[PDB]
Paper text:
Here we determined the atomic resolution electron cryo-microscopy (cryo-EM) structure of the Leishmania ribosome in complex with paromomycin (PAR), a highly potent compound recently approved for treatment of the fatal visceral leishmaniasis (VL). To delineate the PAR mechanism of action in Leishmania we employed cryo-EM to obtain the structure of intact cytosolic ribosomes derived from L. donovani in complex with the compound. Taken together, the biochemical and structural data presented here indicate that AGs mediate their activity against Leishmania by interfering primarily with cytosolic translation, and that their induced activities in these eukaryotic parasites is highly differentiated when compared to bacteria and higher eukaryotes.
The nominal map resolutions for SSU and LSU were 2.7 and 2.5 Å, respectively. The high resolution of the map enabled the complete characterization of all four PAR sugar rings including the directionality of ring substituents, thus facilitating a full description of PAR interaction pattern within the Leishmania binding pocket. In our Leishmania ribosome structure the eS30 N-terminal region penetrates deeply into the decoding center maintaining direct contacts with the PAR-binding pocket at h44 as well as with the anticodon loop of the A-site tRNA. His5 of eS30, a highly conserved residue within the decoding center, is prone to interact via its imidazole amines with the N1 position of the flipped-out adenine residues as well as with the phosphate backbone of A-site tRNA residue A37.
Numbering used by the authors:
A (entry chain c): 2 to 85
B (entry chain b): 2 to 104
C (entry chain B): 1 to 211
D (entry chain P): 1 to 72
E (entry chain J): 2 to 130
F (entry chain V): 2 to 123
G (entry chain Y): 3 to 90
H (entry chain F): 44 to 263
Amino acid sequence: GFFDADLSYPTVRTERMKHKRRRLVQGPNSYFMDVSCPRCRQVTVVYSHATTSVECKGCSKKLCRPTGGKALLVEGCGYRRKPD
Amino acid sequence: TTKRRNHGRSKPAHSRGRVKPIHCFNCGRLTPKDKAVGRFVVRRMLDAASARDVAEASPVYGANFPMPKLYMKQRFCIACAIHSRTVRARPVGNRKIRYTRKV
Amino acid sequence: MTAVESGSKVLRMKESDAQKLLAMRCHIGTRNQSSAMKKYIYGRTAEGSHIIDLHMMWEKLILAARVIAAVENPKDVCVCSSRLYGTRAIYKFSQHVGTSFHGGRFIPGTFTNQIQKKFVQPRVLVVTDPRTDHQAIREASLVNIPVIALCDTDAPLEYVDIAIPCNNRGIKSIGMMYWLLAREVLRLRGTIVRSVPWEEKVDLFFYRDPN
Amino acid sequence: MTKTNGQNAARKLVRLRRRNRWADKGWKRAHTFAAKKANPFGGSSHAKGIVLEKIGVGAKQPNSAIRKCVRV
Amino acid sequence: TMMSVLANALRTIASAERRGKRQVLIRPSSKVVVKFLQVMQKHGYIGEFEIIDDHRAGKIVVNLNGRLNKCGAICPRFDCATTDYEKWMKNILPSRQFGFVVLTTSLGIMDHEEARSRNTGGKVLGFFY
Amino acid sequence: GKIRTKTVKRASRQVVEKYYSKLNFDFYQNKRVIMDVTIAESKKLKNKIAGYTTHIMKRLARGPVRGISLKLQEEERERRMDHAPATSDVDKAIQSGVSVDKRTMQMLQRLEIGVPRRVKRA
Amino acid sequence: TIGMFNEEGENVDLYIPRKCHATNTLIEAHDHAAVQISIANVGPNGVINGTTTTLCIAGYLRSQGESDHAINHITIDRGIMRIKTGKP
Amino acid sequence: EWVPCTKLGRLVKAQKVTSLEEIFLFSMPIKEHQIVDTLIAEGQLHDEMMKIYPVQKATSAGQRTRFKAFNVVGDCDGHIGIGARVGKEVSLAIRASMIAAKLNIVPVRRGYWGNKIGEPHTIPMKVTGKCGSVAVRLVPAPRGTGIVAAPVPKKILEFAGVEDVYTSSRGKTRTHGNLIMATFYALRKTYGFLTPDLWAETEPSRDPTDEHAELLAEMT
RNA sequence: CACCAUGUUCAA
RNA sequence: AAGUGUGGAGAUCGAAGAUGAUUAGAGACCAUUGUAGUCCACACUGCAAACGAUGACACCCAUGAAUUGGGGAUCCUUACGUAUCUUUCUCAGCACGUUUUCUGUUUUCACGCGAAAGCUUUGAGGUUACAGUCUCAGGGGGGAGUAC
Ligand SMILES: *O[C@H]1[C@H](O)[C@@H](N)[C@@H](O[C@H]2[C@H](O[C@@H]3O[C@H](CO)[C@@H](O[C@H]4O[C@@H](CN)[C@@H](O)[C@H](O)[C@H]4N)[C@H]3O)[C@@H](O)[C@H](N)C[C@@H]2N)O[C@@H]1CO
Ligand SMILES: [Mg+2]
Ligand SMILES: [Mg+2]
Ligand SMILES: [Mg+2]
Ligand SMILES: [Mg+2]
C-alpha cells in the first residue's frame, strides 16, 4: 500500500495481469521461437500459437501440434524464444 | 409484491426455459423439479425397540453387521410440504436462510 | 507518520521496537481479508494467515499518536473496547495518557442522548475493534467524532479515519499495541525521553481472567 | 426507453403524436363527430322541448329521496 | 453500438467525478473530445490530461481536481443563433453567473461566452459547470 | 414463595452494599438487621428482603455478583491484580528468540532497519 | 478573497464553509459525520510544537469506507507520513 | 433557568460562541433549542405554524389519535428551520414543533440573477429538493419578480430571506407534509453546490470545543 | 384431512 | 398445452359420460371406471402468468464466497510464493491446489435510485444538475378486446 494507482503509468503487477486488449495499449501475447528438429537438426521458426502443423523443411517431419492455446512442440526438440 | 426473489423456484431468468415436472410424493400434483421441495430420507426399517427383537432372532444381524434401511428421495408439492410440516412458513427476515446440507 | 518538518529520523521504527512487535505476534493477521485493509498486507504465509507490513503498521501507529498528543484536555479522547481482551489495556492506556475510557457494553445513546447522565462528548474516539465496537463508531458518525481503530485484516472501515493495522485478537498482541501507543504519546508530549527505555512493564496491559 | 432524438427525426415525432392524441378523451371528443351527432342538443346549449310526462327518479345510495323531473 | 463518442466521454467524466475519483480513462477519443477538454482546462474545471497513442483511436487519462459538477452533451447538436444564447443559458445552466455551454462554430469549438463576444453562432455540443 | 419483585431485589442489594459486614448466611439474624436498616411498613416485604439478601450472601462467598457495587472487595482485588514481575513477558520473549516465519523473515530483509537481533527463522 | 462579492467588493454571503481535503466537496452544515483531524507538527527532538496540521473530511467519504484511504493520500502529500521504507 | 448539557450550549451560554454561523461552519448538531434564540436576536426571529393535521392509529377498541404539527422558523436573512412533532393534544404538538424547528435551523445561500448591486435577491443557482414524491425546484428570478410559488413554499421562502424566485413542483403537492420538507431540502442545498467563487483554498480553523477545551473542563 | 351454508338499508 | 384434418398406435393417465359416496342439494371435490385425447407421421392453428409481469444495441459502475466452458503461469515502486494421488492405454494422460484473465448463469454487498416493496457492474443507478441510438405500447374505472 501507500502508493496510489496512476492510470497513465500503471504498476507492472497490475498491468501484467490484464487481458491483452484490456491493457493501456493493447498488444500480442504470442512470440516466435527457433525450434531445432529432433533428428535432422536444422532450425525452424515456429509461432507459439501455431494452429497449423509446421513441418521441418529439411527433416520432412512435423515438429509442432496445435492445441486450444499455445501449440505443443514435439518431444526431444530444443527451442529458445526469439525477441521482439 | 414479489414475495421472494427467485419466485419460489431454483430457476433464474436466463438459464432454463422450463424444467419437466415430477409428480408430488403423496398428492401426485405435477410441480417442476426445481420448485418442489426435495428431501432424501435415510429412514430405518425398524424402530430401535423393534430392531432389537429382530437382531436377537437373527443369525446375520448384530452389532457387527448393521441392518438395512430405506433410501427413497421424496419430492413434495408446496401445498403438500406445508401440510405435512416438512417445510413451514418463516418470518420475512428469516426466509433467506438456506441449508446446504442435512442438519 | 514518521516524517517531521525538519527531516529528522526521530520517530522512525527501531530494531528494538520492531523486535517487540514480532515477539507479541501483533503483525499476524487473520485468515480472511477485506478490500480496505488489503493495502496493509505484505503477503500471506503458509497455513493461510496474512502478514502485515511493519512499515505501514508503524506509520499508522505514529499517525494516531500525533493526533492524540495534539489534544489539550486529554479527557476528550475516549478509548473503548467491547471485546473482553481489551478492557485491561484500555484502563492502563487511560492511566498513563490521561484519557477517558469505557469497557463492556457501550450503552447506546452515550454520544447522542443528551439528557442521559452518562452523556460524554469526546473529540477523538479510539476503538479496539471496528467490528465489536460497531456501536461506538456508529454514534461517532452522528456527532462529529473521528475514529482511531486497531484493525485486523478483515475490518469494516466505514467511518474509521485512522485505521491502525495490527493483530487485535490475542491477549498479548492487544495491549502491546496499547503499550506502544501509550509509550509513544508520552514521548510526543515530552513526559518521557526517547533515549532511555520506558521502565513501565507491558504485563499490566494484558487481560487476566480473574476467576 | 421512451422517445427518439435525431436531427432528421421529425416525421417520426409528428406521426407519433398525432396517433397518441386520439387517446386523449378531450382531444378525441373535440375532433370526432359522434360527439355532436349523439349529443341530444345539437352540439349547442339550451335546447327547447315539449314536456311529455312527469317522473320521480329515486336518489342513489346513500341518499334517499325521489327527484322531481320531467321527460321532454 | 457507440453512436456519439463525445457523449460517451462526457458521461464517463461526469460519472467518475460524482464518485469523487482522481483520474478517468476515456475511450475512445477524438479531435472533438480533446477540444472539448481544452475548453474545460482553460476555465479550470479539469487538470492536465494525457492522450495515449494507439494506432487506433486514442485513450485519454484526465486528472480531475474536484471542481466539475456536471459535464454533459446535448444530442442532437442543435443549431444556435446569436439571439439564442440567453435561451440556452436558462435551460441547461444552473445560473447566469457560472457554467458554460460549449458550441462548435465556424471560428472553432468555443464556450457560449466567447462566442457571444465574437458575434458568432454554432451548433451546441455540450456543457460543463 | 415465587419470584421476588424488583422492589424486593433492588432494596436487597442496597442492604448488601451499606451493611455487608453485619450480615451472614442465616435468615433469622439478617431479618433483625433489616428491620433496623430499612424503614418500610410491611413485614411481608422485610421477610422477602431478608430472604434475597441471604441468597446473595451465599453468592458472595462463591464469587462476584453482578450489580453488587461492593467497592472494597473491588478496591482490594484491583490492588492485588496490578502486580507485575520484574522481568517483562516481552523481555523473556526476546531472550529465547522471536522465531519468525518464512514470509515474515522475507519481509524483514526489506526494512530500513534490517532484520533485528535475537531473531530466528523456524 | 473567497465567496461572492457585491460589485462594491464587500463579502456578501454569510459563512464561507469548509471543503473536504480529499474530494474538494463543500461541507454542509448538517453533515454530522464530517470531522476535522488535527495532526501535531513535531520538532527535531520528537516533541510536539504549538502548531498542528488540520485536515477535514466530508461525511459521505467516511460513510463508504474510503476515508482511511484518503487520510493516507493527504498525509503523504503534506509530508506527514512516509510512503515506503528506506533502502536497507 | 436553563442549565445546558452539551458543550456547544455551555459555550453559547458563556458567550464564547458568539454567532450562529460559527456552529454552521463546524457542522455541529445543535441538540438544544436554547442555543438558537440566544444567538439570534429575539425580535428578529419569526415563527408560525404551517399545518396541523391528525394521524390515527387503529387499535383494539377504536382509534388512537395524535396531531402532527408543522412549524417553520427563521429570520428573513438566510436562516430557516422546519420541525415536525406529534402529540395527543393539539397544544402540545404545536409547542413541540417550535422546539423542533429551531434545532433544524440551517443557512440559505443567496445570490444574484444578473449584475450584483446590493443584498442578494435570489438563490445563486437552480436547486431542487425531494421528499417523498414531492420535489420542488427553485430557479433564480430577475430583480423585481417576487416569489412565484404555491402559498406553502411561499411562506417558507419568505422566512428564508429569498426575495425573488421561480418555483416548480413535480408531484402530489396536496400532501403538505412532504411539500414543506422539500422546500426545506432545496434551500438547504444552496450551500452544497461548489461555485467558482468558492474554488479558492481557505485556511483551516479550530473547533469551538477544540479552542475552549480548558474552559469547558472548568464546568466539571 | 367426515360435515360446517348464510347474516336486510343508511348511519354511529 | 389444448384443438383440427388424414393415416398409425392405443400401455398408462384420462375432458365428455356412467356408476358409488358425501351433501339440505352435489350437476363438484373423494372412490371405481371410461370416450375424445395423451404418443408418432404429415398438414393446419398461432389464442399462454409465451414471466424477470422488466424491448433491443453501446457506455460508466464498489465488495466478498462461489459456479460453468476456454486459455495462460507453478510525492504515488524497475518487477518475483506452488502442494496433493491415480497412472498398461480415445495416455507426452486424468482430477486437484494457488493465482491470472475472457465468456456465460447467479448469490450476500458500496454509491445512488424509488411512493414503497425493492433494484444495484445481472440497474429499476449514472434523471427537474431532465438530450448515446432506435423501437413498441399507455393516458381515470368501465362498456370491451364488445359491435361493424
Ligand atoms: O474471467 C474471470 C475474470 O477474469 C476474473 N476477474 C474472475 O474474478 C475473480 C475470481 O473469481 C473466480 O473464482 C472462481 C473459482 O471459485 C474462478 O473461476 C475459475 O476457477 C478456476 C479453477 N477451475 C479456473 O480453472 C477457471 O477457469 C475459472 N473460471 C474465478 O473466475 C476469484 O478467484 C479471484 N479471487 C478474484 C477475481 N476477481 O472471474 C471471471 C469469471 O468469473
Ligand atoms: Mg415457460
Ligand atoms: Mg340467500
Ligand atoms: Mg367425501
Ligand atoms: Mg382409470
